[PDB]
């Protein structure tokens, strides 16, 4: 079950296609850029990613590069892979040094070498939307 | 007065476009369909309760909601506004579904400067609706996660 504790919600954001180039990393900062439900008090619980790569390789979360060797996760060419990263109820300012890094055995420069599904993020429920306090001045 | 809602209603908002100058002298109309277009929280089972608009116009005039939708807003229900004076309205949407409101429009009738750009400048639209279903990732998202 992907059902969450009552005070959490899922949010999602589309992932960009990867262009050709000349290691690969998606910073957590970038993943959350522009999600309106997220502000500086938001607590983060889970990050789900899913992808298909054109090569075998490894990937992992890092914090500061090479992903650490112990704990590196593997993936196979043309095979859907996912991961549920635990974000530990932290705030953005304790996660904005993190990135997911991929290391491909081959086709390391090809466009679309990794194709991500949308990112899913379990976060603390934001404050409900409210219109401005004085929106209904001169309403009759 | 508080804008707090009942009972698993939420507010949603969408930006309103600037109005461009126009060639033909007609009254102006924003269909409700257009106001709600692209709001993800809204689906075919959504119930609607309130629509709030706020605006400033460059002329005195009148406005109102109309159905069966460019006529002058009917006399019954017809609201006035003054030049350069913030005006708002809380339209009651009666708990209706979209398919019972998608003939509605808000119509403005300006006494003057009827073709000028920015002749009406709208704030964002605010809509009180029934809470939608929470977002869920696809059931099979975590295949091959370990």
Query: What is the separation, in whole angstroms, between the first and last Cα of chain B?
Result: 53
Contacts of B11 in chain A (CB under 8 A): 128-131
Say yes or no for a CB contact (<8 Å) between A10 and B143. Answer: no
CA distance A74 to B146: 10
Take residue B122 and report the two structure tokens written for it: 């709208």
CA distance A89 to A97: 16
Q: Which residues have a Cβ under 8 Å from the Cβ of A120 and sit 6 or more positions away?
A: A10, A11, A12, A46, A47, A48, A49, B137, B141
What is the torsional sign of CA A83, A88, A93, A98?
negative
3-class DSSP state of A16:
coil
Residue (of A37, A36, A32) closest to A14 by Cα position: A32
CA distance B49 to A31: 35
Question: To the nearest whole angstrom, how far is the Cα of A124 from the nearest Cα of chain B?
Answer: 13
A2 vs B3, B54, B136: nearest CB: B136
CA distance A11 to B16: 25
Contacts of A129 in chain B (CB under 8 A): 10-13
Say yes or no for a CB contact (<8 Å) between A135 and B1. Answer: no
Tokens 């992903």 found at? A67
DSSP label of B99? G
Contacts of B126 in chain A (CB under 8 A): 131, 135
Q: Which residues pair with B109 in a beta bridge?
A: B62
Say if residues B11 and B133 touch (Cβ distance below 8 Å): no
β strands within chain A, DSSP E: 8-13, 24-27, 43-53, 57-63, 73-75, 81-91, 98-104, 114-116, 119-124
Domain parsing of chain A, residue ranges: 1-140
Tokens 């949308």 found at? A118
Longest dimension (CA), chain A: 69
Q: What is the resolution of this structure in A?
A: 2.4
Say if residues A20 and A109 touch (Cβ distance below 8 Å): yes
Say yes or no for a CB contact (<8 Å) between A131 and B3. Answer: yes
Which H/E stretch holds residue B36?
A: helix B32-36
Residue (of A137, A130, A118, A97) closest to A47 by Cα position: A118
Say if residues A83 and A32 touch (Cβ distance below 8 Å): no
Q: Is B11 on the interface with A (CB under 8 A)?
A: yes
Longest dimension (CA), chain B: 69
Residues B49, A3, B8: CA angle, nearest 5 degrees = 15
Residues A20, A23, A27: CA angle, nearest 5 degrees = 95
């Amino acid at each position: 079950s992907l059902k969450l504790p009552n005070n959490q919600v899922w949010v999602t954001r589309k992932a960009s296609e990867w262009s050709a180039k000349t290691n690969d990393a998606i910073p957590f900062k970038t993943i959350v850029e522009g999600i309106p439900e997220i502000n500086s008090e938001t607590k983060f619980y889970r990050l789900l990613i899913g992808f298909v790569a054109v090569s075998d390789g490894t990937f992992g979360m890092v914090d500061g590069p090479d992903p650490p060797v112990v704990g590196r996760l593997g993936f196979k060419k043309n095979t859907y892979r996912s991961r549920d990263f635990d974000l530990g109820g932290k705030l953005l300012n304790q996660l904005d040094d993190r990135a997911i890094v991929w290391c491909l055995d081959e086709r390391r420069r090809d466009a679309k070498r990794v194709q991500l599904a949308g990112y899913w993020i379990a976060i603390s429920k934001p404050a409900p939307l409210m219109p401005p306090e004085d929106f209904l001045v001169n309403q009759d």
